[PDB]
Amino acid sequence: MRDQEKLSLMYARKGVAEQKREKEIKSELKMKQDAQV
DNA sequence: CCCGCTGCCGATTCCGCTGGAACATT
DNA sequence: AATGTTCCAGCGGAATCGGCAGCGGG
DSSP: OOOHHHHHHHHHHHHHHHHHHHHHHHHHHHHHHHTOO
């Protein structure tokens, strides 16, 4: 990838994906620990 | 869009010199 | 009044150092 901007926008989508994943996993961890065996 | 380094560059502090303004004298 | 001294103010060198950008990765 020789285009820095296109790579940056692809990782804009990517990084917002990991941000959403982190938020949802942080939310899930509460009851995941609550009911874990 | 993020995230992270990492150059580097700006500003501070500390000096010191100069200039200008004020002093006090015969 | 003529001048020398003192005082105040301003500029710059030098060292430090922190963060501001920009640049790759995730």
